Amino acid sequence: HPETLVKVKDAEDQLGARVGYIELDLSGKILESFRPEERFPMMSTFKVLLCGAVLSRVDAGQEQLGRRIHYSQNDLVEYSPVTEKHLTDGMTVRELCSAAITMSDNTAANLLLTTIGGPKELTAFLHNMGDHVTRLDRWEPELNEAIPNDERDTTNPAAMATTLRKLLTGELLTLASRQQLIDWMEADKVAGPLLRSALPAGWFIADKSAGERGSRGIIAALGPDGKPSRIVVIYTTGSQATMDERNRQIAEIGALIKHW
């Protein structure tokens, strides 16, 4: 709807930044878009693609979701909310993805990146499924740098939204693996000041947002009747706006619900 585009336009103004936005029918049709070809940093939304890669190896037998991974104190990086709790007994692959998606754990995400072969293997994995845009080059926390004009660790709203539809509804993952990817995102707890605050009652939402610079990159699948029917991706550029400035714009952008 045109009343939603004006709002994304307004957001770029209030923020002094560039806002990438796409809405996609979960038919694959592009219902609305705004700069769907600008490259944006993922910074946490790769974590949904990461476990997508992981579950791709679980389905084929190349990985086990119950396998326990052990890591040391030196492997810690900022925002390790779960991995900090299990330094002694370690965690399982199933518990790391749940830590990477539901709580944006940077260490867990690193531990998983090491299992699949690093950022280049999550790049090569995206290439082999038709996403030649999305790329990862670095480990947490560095991949969040958001350098201007820097293409490392970037996507665009068009690539992410399509790649997300393939994982959740394509033949890429098995029925249970698709159910798990959306269950983790549906269990996202660090996206309250986002579309979630806009979501009406009885509506579905599964997303991936967790920090001062964290709400720039948001991906989500939502729909009425407790069932997802569309995908939404929203990326924003770095400006002098604070975290609380950005969320209100996304919360006001999200507040897309009125013109569903």
Handedness of CA 100, 179, 52, 38 (dihedral sign): negative
Is 142 tagged catalytic? yes
Please tell me the distance from the alpha carbon of residue 167 to that of residue 49, in angstroms, as a whole number: 8
Q: Is 189 annotated as a binding residue?
A: no
Q: What is the CATH number of domain 1-260?
A: 3.40.710.10
Q: Which of 213, 233, 236 minimizes the C-alpha distance to 222? A: 233
Q: Give the per-residue SS3 of 86-106.
A: CCCCCEEHHHHHHHHHHCCCH
Helix axis angle, 93-102 to 46-59, nearest 10°: 160
State the Cα–Cα distance between residues 65 and 115, nearest whole angstrom: 12
CA distance 229 to 231: 7
33 classed as catalytic: no
Distance (Å, whole) CA 181 – CA 206: 9
For 93, how many CA atoms within 13 A lie in the half-sphere containing its CB? 21
Could you tell me if 157 and 200 are in contact, meaning their C-beta atoms sit under 8 angstroms apart? no
Collect all residues with Cβ–Cβ distance below 8 Å to 129 and sequence separation of at least 6.
163, 166, 172
The domain ranges of the chain are 1-260
Rounded CA gap, 231 and 228, in Å? Answer: 8
CA angle 69, 72, 74 (to 5 degrees): 135
- To the question of whether residue 208 is assigned a binding role by annotation, the answer is yes
Helix (H) or strand (E) holding 108, with range, is helix 106-116
